[PDB]
Design a protein around this nucleic acid. Structure first.
Lengths: 115, 49, 214, 174, 92
RNA sequence: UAAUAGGGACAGUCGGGGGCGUCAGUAUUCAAUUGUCAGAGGUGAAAUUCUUGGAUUUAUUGAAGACUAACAACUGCGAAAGCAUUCGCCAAGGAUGUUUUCAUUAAUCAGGAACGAUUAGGGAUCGGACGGCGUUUAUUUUUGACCCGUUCGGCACCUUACGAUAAAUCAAAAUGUUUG
């Protein structure tokens, strides 16, 4: 049962899916949201999360990963602490495509001071 | 009596401001207690002392 | 450039000690060691944060993540010992209840191996039984008194019991219960947790203490 | 057994206590089991294996967050669509004066909530003012425009000018 | 002008169906009094009445003027009990 | 007379009140190291912009600016603008209580100056003091958290106004309609 780390950083205009190892050093496969649909308007869309999600997941299964641990965040510096329309469909399509996940937990960088 | 604790308190606040002369609300406490020096020095001077 | 890294990258092993009840923790795919940038900084210097629920197999421990500095490399092997620990973010959200007091302390400790470890800790005011009041507030000199009982108890049961005994005291939360029954003479203070423990630089690389942990 | 938890207060205890089977019915339709801790008073959601949609536990953590933040339970259970998303906007440190900041938050609320619901009809979203925060649920464009609205309202522009601007935007959507 | 109609007429245009996020409004979109085949002109009656009330009217057509006093005290008592419960639920 | 008006002494305190310094905390920007490797993004439509020397992103450090999110209140401190990490020091100040004293020192403000008599009680709010037909600390005495009563002192709610009256202001604009 090989496990990895699949990460999501989805703003209101773009979605990032970034698979790294169980420490966070080695980039396995990352695809931005514009490498999908390539309309200049809705790069954060759940269909773009469908393309990037099935692409990264089905690619990394040809690399044989067989499990992933997903972390999820948006631009939590001074924007919202809720992701856009990319995280729900990225977890949906990475989830329903084949693989198996145990625990789920997301980490979002709270500013304890900002303004 | 009371007047010695008044001048102990007041000169103590003066020494505090002489350690930092930029604490202006404690400077307001100084002008309060100095106003009490004018007050009770005036009245207890007019008693006869 | 077409870089494509399939051949030059290998699948290392990262393994779990005896106090972490699971056998394996990771199979970690980094880069193959060779001359012209050997792998010891692309090796050991990495740290490695995982949950403790699979490590001690009790899946009630889905909080309390740990960092792990990589320290022992064989060919097709690794064995990782305790370096860092941090409380889980949404559970330090889930313990903040309105109408009582949250208590913070940032204690700087060093162990007799001169191990520079901070202990960030947060406790929470208990609403007593038979309490009709909507508040349970403290009195800020009572909070200060709580906090020098806090650094009093963590300094009293710190500066001893080295990292086998220290993390063997950390993980089944003996620190929390000794803070609880030690400091409830002043103020009840349930939900005692130990938010972060900070090591910054392990001052050695040496393998004797590492195999002494393994 | 993936368990999230968040913590509610003792006034909220009753409304959660008899809004709860509508919630755990609405999440037993997603398989996510949930309980109320009555003695401690907490909200526990957890997935067993039978979750067809593992995004629904993001929906459930965001859900019971919105139940601790004192939103009505049908409005909290409208997070379980696709486009509906939670958000909060914190403003108590955005504006530095106390009574002027109260004048600004009730300038945002308005005369019997009329400017607030005019913003909600311009932006298709739900907005609730809770204490020192501003909860808002809905689509992501509406969340962005509402965050523009709360920022520009706290930095002394009147929501009559902001509703002028948003209605001219909706007329310039064609 | 039309913005005064927007902010003034917002509880009625929002009371019909026009906010699918909001629970009262999208409950009211399939309540039944707007899934009947004639609804936008009912609400157009109420909003033209609100317009004349803006144009200097003290009384509406919409209100029943004569009631048997226990119906009336029950309704006004019921509105006051609802708003008193709302303001005691605005301490959250 | 010790005044149901003084200022102070003493005691356990109290305050996110002020000043000095320290101590952390996150995030923002910057730099470096990797893993990188076609977009990132800025929005109402779109562009300037960064971008085969790698921009966004991942991880790990260091430096600096800011502030002290969440506990944060129908509260607490200070007259004001104000007051939010821990700890130390420096003085003030409030409140209670005393078996403390010069005993009228009092009360309101031109000239001037620093900082920017009750409503009628009820239910809640703390800051003390006293008491306990109660748990728990506690291996049992202290002691403290909870519950109760008395009690003061304040910050606000609610009704009736004890009334008013210039109304939009009210437990005060109660004392401008039998005015002293």
């Amino acid at each position: 049962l090989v496990f990895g780390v699949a990460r999501i950083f989805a703003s209101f205009n773009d979605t990032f899916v970034h698979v790294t190892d169980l420490s966070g050093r080695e980039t396995i496969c990352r695809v931005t949201g514009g490498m999908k649909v390539k309309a200049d308007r809705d790069e954060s869309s759940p269909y773009a999360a469908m393309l990037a999600a099935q692409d990264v997941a089905a690619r990394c299964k040809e690399l044989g990963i067989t499990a992933l641990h997903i972390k999820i965040r948006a631009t939590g510096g001074n924007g919202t602490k809720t992701p856009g329309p990319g995280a729900q469909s990225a977890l949906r399509a990475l989830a329903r495509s084949g693989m198996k996940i145990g625990r789920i937990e997301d980490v979002t960088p709270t500013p304890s001071d900002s303004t | 009596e009371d007047l010695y604790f008044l001048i102990k308190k007041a000169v103590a606040v003066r020494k505090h401001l002489e350690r930092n002369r930029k604490d202006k609300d404690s400077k307001f406490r100084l002008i309060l207690i100095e106003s009490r020096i004018h007050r009770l020095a005036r009245y207890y001077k007019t008693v006869g002392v | 450039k077409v870089q494509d890294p399939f051949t030059r990258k290998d699948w290392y092993n990262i393994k779990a000690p005896a106090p972490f009840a699971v056998r394996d923790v990771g199979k970690t795919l980094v880069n193959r060691t060779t001359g012209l940038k050997n792998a010891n900084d692309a090796l050991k210097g990495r740290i490695f944060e995982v949950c403790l629920a699979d490590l001690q197999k009790d899946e009630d421990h889905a909080f309390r993540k740990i960092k792990l500095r990589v320290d022992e490399v064989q060919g097709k092997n690794c064995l990782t010992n305790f370096h860092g620990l941090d409380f889980t973010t949404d559970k330090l959200r889930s313990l903040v209840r309105k109408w009582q007091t949250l208590i913070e302390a940032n204690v700087t400790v060093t162990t007799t191996d001169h191990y520079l470890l901070r202990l960030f800790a947060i406790a929470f005011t208990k609403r007593r039984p038979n309490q009709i009041k909507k508040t349970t507030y403290a009195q800020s000199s009572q909070i200060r008194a709580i906090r020098r009982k806090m650094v009093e108890i963590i300094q009293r049961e710190a500066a001893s019991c080295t990292l086998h005994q220290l993390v063997s005291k950390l993980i089944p939360e003996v620190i929390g219960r000794e803070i609880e029954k030690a400091t409830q003479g002043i103020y009840p203070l349930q939900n005692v947790h130990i938010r972060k423990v900070k090591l910054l630089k392990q001052p050695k690389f040496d393998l004797g203490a590492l195999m002494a942990l393994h | 057994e993936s368990s999230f938890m968040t913590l509610f207060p003792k006034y909220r205890e009753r409304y959660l206590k008899d809004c709860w089977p509508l919630v755990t019915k609405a999440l037993e339709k997603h398989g996510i089991a949930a309980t109320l801790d009555i003695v401690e008073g907490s909200m526990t959601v957890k997935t067993t294996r039978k979750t067809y949609d593992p995004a629904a536990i993001l929906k459930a953590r965001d859900l019971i967050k919105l139940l601790a933040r004192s939103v009505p339970a049908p409005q909290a259970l409208k997070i379980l669509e696709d486009g509906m998303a939670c958000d909060i906007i914190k403003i108590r440190s955005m504006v530095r004066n106390k009574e002027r900041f109260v004048k600004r938050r009730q300038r945002l609320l308005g005369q019997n909530g009329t400017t607030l619901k005019a913003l909600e009809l311009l932006t298709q979203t739900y907005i609730l003012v809770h204490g020192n925060t501003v909860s808002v649920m809905g689509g992501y464009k509406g969340l962005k425009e509402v965050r523009r609205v709360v920022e520009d309202t706290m930095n002394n522009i009147h929501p009559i000018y902001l509703i002028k601007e948003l209605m001219i935007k909706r007329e310039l959507a064609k | 002008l039309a913005l005064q109609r927007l902010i003034a007429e917002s509880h009625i245009l929002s009371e019909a169906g026009a906010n699918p996020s909001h629970w009262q409004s999208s409950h009211a979109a399939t309540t039944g009094t707007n899934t009947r085949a004639f609804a936008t002109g009912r609400i157009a009656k109420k909003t033209t009445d609100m317009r004349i009330q803006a144009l200097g009217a003290k009384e509406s057509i919409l209100t029943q003027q004569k009631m048997p006093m226990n119906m009336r005290k029950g309704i006004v008592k019921h509105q006051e009990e609802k708003e008193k419960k709302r303001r005691q639920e605005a301490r959250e």
